[PDB]
Amino acid sequence: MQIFVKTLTGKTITLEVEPSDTIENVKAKIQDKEGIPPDQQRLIFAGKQLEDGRTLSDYNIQKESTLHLVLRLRG
Amino acid sequence: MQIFVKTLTGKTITLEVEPSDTIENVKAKIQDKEGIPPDQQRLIFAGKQLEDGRTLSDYNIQKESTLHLVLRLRG
Ligand SMILES: [Zn+2]
Ligand SMILES: [Zn+2]
Ligand SMILES: [Zn+2]
Ligand SMILES: [Zn+2]
Ligand SMILES: [Zn+2]
Ligand SMILES: [Zn+2]
Ligand SMILES: [Zn+2]
Ligand SMILES: [Zn+2]
Ligand SMILES: [Zn+2]
Ligand SMILES: [Zn+2]
């Protein structure tokens, strides 16, 4: 299935994914297109922060769902 | 000759048909009544998905037989 990600530029990318992909899997896909490392990625869906160990199905993220990418800086 | 078409939502459609009607004809009839494109229709009878080119009689679909309409997710 396809989901969309609102990137740090404000544009929208399309990701090919499976219901059981982890948030970590999605972050790896995002780095390939945008050049942001997973550690600096925070993903938002329906106003909620997504945890690396959980899957798209866990959050009931269906096809054409839109995730928001937000920069995570520490220190 | 009359048949019933049940949708996922438990809705019951009644169609006027003939034994020689093709599944394509049935889909055209459903598009007339419900406005759904044949492309997006899957028709099932006795657990079997019906093929566009075959007829109701090919499938032993009779007066007052019930078909199930499954929709192909858009996209
Ligand atoms: Zn797909
Ligand atoms: Zn697809
Ligand atoms: Zn797989
Ligand atoms: Zn991580
Ligand atoms: Zn869309
Ligand atoms: Zn009749
Ligand atoms: Zn006739
Ligand atoms: Zn057709
Ligand atoms: Zn009767
Ligand atoms: Zn659509």
From Swiss-Prot, chains A, B:
Residues 1-75 form the Ubiquitin-like domain. The record marks 54, 72 as: Interacts with activating enzyme. The record marks 68 as: Essential for function. The modification (Microbial infection) ADP-ribosylthreonine is found at residue 66. There is a cross-link at residues 6, 11, 27, 29, 33, 48, 63 (Glycyl lysine isopeptide (Lys-Gly) (interchain with G-Cter in ubiquitin)). It comes from the Eukaryota. Changing residue 68 to G: Loss of DTX3L-mediated polyubiquitination of histone H3 and H4. It is found in: Cytoplasm; Nucleus. Phosphorylated at Ser-65 by PINK1 during mitophagy. Phosphorylated ubiquitin specifically binds and activates parkin (PRKN), triggering mitophagy. Phosphorylation does not affect E1-mediated E2 charging of ubiquitin but affects discharging of E2 enzymes to form polyubiquitin chains. It also affects deubiquitination by deubiquitinase enzymes such as USP30. The modification Phosphoserine is found at residue 65. Exists either covalently attached to another protein, or free (unanchored). When covalently bound, it is conjugated to target proteins via an isopeptide bond either as a monomer (monoubiquitin), a polymer linked via different Lys residues of the ubiquitin (polyubiquitin chains) or a linear polymer linked via the initiator Met of the ubiquitin (linear polyubiquitin chains). This is Ubiquitin. The lineage of its organism: Eukaryota, Metazoa, Chordata, Craniata, Vertebrata. The chain holds residues 1 to 75 of 128 of the full protein.
